Symmetry: C2
Subunit: 136 residues, 2 copies
């Protein structure tokens, strides 16, 4: 067949797009942007994060990430942790919202993993885990 | 560990981003933009192609794609086949050949590094995931 159709980078990028599409539809409906949800997703377990780590987890440039975090701050979702390497945490409202979104994310993920269970892709998660490990 | 740690969409997005970042730097060097590279990639193996299909394969919204293709045209990399179908010019082709060669070299190093691992069949896994998602 053709180059693109079998190219690893294409297959990765298309997958991530198509797999994310439905959940991103949901975020959009909630009036939220994808980067905003990712910040929420990162902060749900952790108590506080440096904007620089938030950027790396969210796959964004530092400054774009901070424009976003500032907006969430203004809205009351997120706050700066006081100090004497700044860190950022969910507010209560932030934490409520993150929690209900992470719930949806998980259910949507389970829907998909189920659909994959019979197939070749059943262990997609370890596979990708392996990939990132190698890519390090 | 944490939620994001094991969350499939993160695992997909981060993989894709990390696998690409390697190659996406070379592209930057040859003085290209990611969507231009993608157009060259699509057109290396095909004679003509619709802008709709180009956009599809490149994960681009169609009008952004059409702007970009049209600028490539102005720069002499791509031309319309005399119904709108785009093909590479000789120059575009020399450039595609060159970048796709790099792509296939990077790809080989990656897949080679995966051959000892669970991830050895990654391409098949992904093409299955894609087939389910349709």
């Amino acid at each position: 067949d053709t180059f693109v159709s079998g190219y690893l980078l294409y297959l990765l990028a298309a997958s991530s797009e198509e797999a994310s599409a439905q959940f991103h539809d949901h975020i959009r409906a909630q009036g939220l942007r994808v980067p905003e949800w990712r910040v929420l997703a990162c902060l749900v377990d952790n108590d506080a994060m440096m904007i620089t780590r938030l950027a790396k987890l969210s796959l964004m440039e530092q400054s774009r990430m901070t424009r976003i975090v500032d907006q969430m701050d203004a809205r009351g979702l997120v706050t700066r942790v006081a100090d004497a390497r700044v860190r950022v945490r969910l507010t209560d409202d932030g934490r409520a919202l993150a929690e209900s979104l992470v719930a949806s994310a998980r259910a949507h993920e389970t829907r998909l993993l189920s659909a994959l269970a019979d197939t070749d892709a059943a262990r997609i998660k370890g596979v990708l885990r392996t990939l990132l490990d190698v890519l390090d």
